[PDB]
């Protein structure tokens with residue numbers, strides 16, 4: 001894989017790929033991701049951080065926006081407590097091996113120019129579109145607040161992207177990013193990462209849903225979570241165990257089993273794994289055993305540093 005293919009690997013879309021190729025030619029390029037700070041950092045976060053690390057390996061300067069004001073607007077609590085969750089997230093991201101600059105949103109998002117741009121964009125953005133943009137992001141609320149529609153307009157504020165060539169986020173961000181594509185004065189390449197399925201297979205992985213493996217989970221804990229996880233024989237779609245295998249594991253993968261079940265299996269790619277599992281040659285228990293043990297090893301250094 002050249003740089004472009006490394007970056008493209010395991011993303012859901014790049015907007016646009018011709019734009020990304022132009023960016024890669026530059027000496028200096030920057031990529032941004034924002035996160036509302038989360039009390040637990042989970043594999044969904046890790047997947048994206050891994051992508052920022054790809055970008056870093058591709059010579060991008062990395063910026064992590066600790067989106068405290070956004071989290072505030074999205075009902076995650078008071079700013080001071082959010083910022084301390086932010087500082088913890090920074091430690092986790094550093095433990096994952098990311099080399100980045102960290103910025104707290106509230107550092108600049110209360111500046112007069114930033115605020116003026118919020119209001120200018122507020123004039124340009126329909127309520128309907130703002131609300132549509134937040135469907136996968138907004139905290140559940142029986143009586144949606146004005147804060148909900150301020151959030152996306154802040155996210156499209158041009159002062160977040162000045163000197164940034166690439167923005168990365170989950171596919172949940174795509175409607176907001178489409179807003180930005182249309183409104184931003186200077187185009188920024190969007191790279192969208194896939195959204196992991198929840199361990200119970202019931203919806204998307206999320207902090208509020210308690211359906212994820214946190215990167216600092218004890219090995220006992222990871223094993224129990226994976227043991228209970230949705231993982232029907234033969235089915236790859238919406239199978240979180242297969243997702244973990246696709247997104248986190250290295251190949252060739254050596255799947256240890258009893259000789260009773262075929263004995264050790266060596267698989268040279270995720271697509272190879274996909275065919276075996278789909279053909280019912282690899283049973284969920286062994287796939288889970290392998291995924292849990294490889295995942296524990298993957299996360300070990302991170303859990304260890306957070307010690």
Ligand SMILES: N[C@@H](Cc1ccc(Br)cc1)C(=O)O
Pocket residue numbers: 033034035036065067070137154155156160169173
């Ligand atoms: N919308 C992202 C947070 C975010 C992302 C990007 C900016 Br700019 C501001 C905030 C959230 O879902 O984590």
